[PDB]
Amino acid sequence: EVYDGAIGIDLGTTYSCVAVYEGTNVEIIANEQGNFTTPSFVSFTENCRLIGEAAKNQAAMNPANTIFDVKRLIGRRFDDPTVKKDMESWPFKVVDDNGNPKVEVQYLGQTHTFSPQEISAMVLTKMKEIAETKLGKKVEKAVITVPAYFNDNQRQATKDAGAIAGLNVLRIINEPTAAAIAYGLGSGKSDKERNVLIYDLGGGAFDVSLLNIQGGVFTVKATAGDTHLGGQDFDTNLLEYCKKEFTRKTKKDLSGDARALRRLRTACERAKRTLSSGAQTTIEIDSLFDGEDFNIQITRARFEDLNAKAFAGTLEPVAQVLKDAGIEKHQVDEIVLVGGSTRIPRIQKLLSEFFDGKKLEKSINPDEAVAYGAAVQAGILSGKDTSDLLLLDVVPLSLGVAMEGNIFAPVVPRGQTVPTIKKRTFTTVATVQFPVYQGERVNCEDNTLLGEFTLAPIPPMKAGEPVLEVVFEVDVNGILKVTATEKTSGRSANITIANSVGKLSTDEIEKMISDAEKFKSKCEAFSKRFEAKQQLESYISRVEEIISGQKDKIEQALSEAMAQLEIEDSTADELKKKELALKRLVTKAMA
């Protein structure tokens, strides 16, 4: 009853996708709606939580309790510029708690504040349950995907979200590398050394990788990208233009109604997807804001002009990854497209022009390749042809410490293969505390603080004589673990971390897990009791129509059933027992 294998979960900004691999074939799993991709929406009702198409349908109906874009918010600090801007754009309310942002929603009649790891854990629970419906067994091992440019806080937060979802995260794989698994194994193969450029432009994140494929070894030569650039930004540009036309043609401004913003955003996304096939489209919506209809024509040229800066901007990480691995465009063997936004013809024309008219490779599915590769890797890691598979990934941004004058000291440089061990020596001015950052800027104020690290047990000596060996280890998941040991006096030194972000202690993870199980239990209770009360009331009505000693016993049992119908404390099982007892008694008396 327990699935001994492992599933692959592509956790995307806009859509999530689950797949499974059993050694012979990889299958993408469809949800209860028949869709192989499930939107990453989580809405909150009075008694349950909606995830997927159900949550996205109730987005305009309840924008304050419909959560989305958690991927752009997970692992970040509350006062980062991107989350301040996003928070200005998002309709739901985000609060600051001890430096960590948490959304505030109305759930189960009370106010609740959820960390991004909890919401992402809800989405992961949904995908896992899709896999469980497909397999018919309990799923507990999984491989989860992250963008290649995710920093340490984001990867650790995503993995913790995988733990809250009740999954054993066997591996955190980079999405372009998983797509490389889908392309190199599927349409291709052959022990032929080839250079593959992976261009993954999704809904919220952007990645580009350069890999060397020799048989079964996948070697990431380089990678670049932007974890806050996707199709929703293009939707934002077209949305801003449409707002300018609305306030221009009606004098009214719709900026204050999140409902109207949601409907207009949906219309702009539909128009964008239409413009990838045609040369023009039209948006017509009723009321919108303050009872003012809207009708505008959008040309493909207008969309491309509105998104020219971003479309052209995507070429900068391409030249970046090209220079970092030291290869030229003539030497790039293939260019594979991954992500929905790659369906934009302007993007493909920019990439094809950049490589001097080279034709783009589009044999793999841009929506399922990531979950495909993740599923293959999970099936291999759980032992479920392809024994030569080797994954040599890379760290995207430098992991270092803050020097004197707050200058970035890289310990693990970008482009370092993974996993790796690095070491750096510290000493005392007379505990030792230093800030660990990640990024690529010289001044650490322009980098991502991994935290303030304090070394707890130090011997008492003169200044400079103790040598403190600090070890930065980066595992196959790409996550940093630091330790400390000094060569004089031997010994070990435990480390404490303050002012961190995206991490959760084991206690908090256990608490969130138990709370999740309690939520699901309450949902099953509400649904089963609801339907049971409906059925019981219907049968009671039929019995009343039928009746209109024995008479009195019937009427009394019917009054008990009505009482159980009025009491909210009644359980579905008790309701079933009452209905069955009614049927037994009425059949005995009638016969």
Add this chain to the structure above:
Amino acid sequence: EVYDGAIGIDLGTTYSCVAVYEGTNVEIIANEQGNFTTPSFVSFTENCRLIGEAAKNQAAMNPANTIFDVKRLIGRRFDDPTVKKDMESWPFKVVDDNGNPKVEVQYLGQTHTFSPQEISAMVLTKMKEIAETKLGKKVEKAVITVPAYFNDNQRQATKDAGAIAGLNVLRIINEPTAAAIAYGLGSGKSDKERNVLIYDLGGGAFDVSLLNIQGGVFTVKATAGDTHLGGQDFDTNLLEYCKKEFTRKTKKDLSGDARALRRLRTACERAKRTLSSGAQTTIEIDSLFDGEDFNIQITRARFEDLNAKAFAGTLEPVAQVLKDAGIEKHQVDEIVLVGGSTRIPRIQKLLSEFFDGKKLEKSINPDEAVAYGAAVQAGILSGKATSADDLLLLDVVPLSLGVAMEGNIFAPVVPRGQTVPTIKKRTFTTVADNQQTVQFPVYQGERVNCEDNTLLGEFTLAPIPPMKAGEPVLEVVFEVDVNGILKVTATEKTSGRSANITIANSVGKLSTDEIEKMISDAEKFKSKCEAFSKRFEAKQQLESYISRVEEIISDKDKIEQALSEAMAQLEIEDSTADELKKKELALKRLVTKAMAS
């Protein structure tokens, strides 16, 4: 550059699905949006025909010119009851042409009439195009799917639609048989004999089939169903309830607004999909009608109560298939589910209760199994699939084919359940001396009074050799080919001689001339659409160029003059792409010459 194989297309009431099979694996092909199912919508504009989700998304904006549900109209007569009720519910205008229904739209600035075979042909051409970008070659052979209970007029109708789409219809395969191929070959195969029950509840049609599956032999033991029962009927019930509640809460009626009915219908389908998973949902749509908002809550029990008679009715064709096949409930080995509407938990509850709580088989994909099996049979028929996989299909006729006697009383000639292909005979004779004509109506169905059957047509047999009354023996032959289509012939066993047959008051039949002309019109429409794309894109590129050289020139008299000429050419709507490009080149010579100075 022509694909030698064949594609399998599932032509559904709501969604169509294309697939290909070459010998090893069968691929379900995704469209331009990456979707494996494309909606069966065709909307007409001033310049082009939109097919698919591009047409479905503008259903609220242009409801009078957006066409759908033609699968419930194809092969039917204008005065059929279902055609009248559906016409009362449809926003587009349907017109009777000598009894044949025809969708009338505003297209290319002029009024246009289309037969259902033409619109179905447009959908089939869209799926064919999907397969063509997938394969990189032009395809011209295909196997098209029809419901098992489709009658003779309907089958001939969709086959002619496949001809109009430019395809060579190698076979007309029944949808539960294609799903049966998907389950018997794709889900898993055993050399053990098994009785498989297939329950296909789609968007507009309903089929139940019992097949004997023995390795590679697929034998249809029986089949029943209802070609006019689907999920859209449940959406119609919920919609009618929503109109009752709206009129109750506002004292106003939206039954006259087509856009309002479309928005409410979309919200009802969405609410049904949600109710398949949860126990309750909410419909909230603002400014639905007369500036009146609409907000109600729909419970699952309310939905099931609204569709209780139809849901309970789905079990009757299952009992019918069990009686016809001579099989008890215990002897059914697997119950496979096909069609999106099968996701309704009430339906699965009814089915499982009908078989004493037996678990239903959900191994195959309920949205792609039909295109799966159709693609398999297409690959085998085209010869592209060789050796790998003994596949044999033995199908039956769904309804009895017969004539009408004195008193309009049905006399069956080919009974239901008869294996295909088949040959049956029935004798006629004259009632007077030197009689030259014997005329009889051919019907399909099971009822005794042909008033409740489907008229295949008035068949006139003439002339007859001059003999005395009741002397000639007119052997009439009802032949049913592998597609399930009826061809009738006549002979006079005395002295042989083929006797000529004429058909009148038919439906779903087209002569070769009309089909060829419809193909030509399709070519003209695609040519006009591609032309419009060329003029539009060339126009936009010329605009961008004019703006660029305005920025450049404002940083010469011939460049200004050529600019004015280009703008004036840009103001004319009848400008060709070659003329626009010629003007852009005329500018380009001047500005590039000035750029080199």
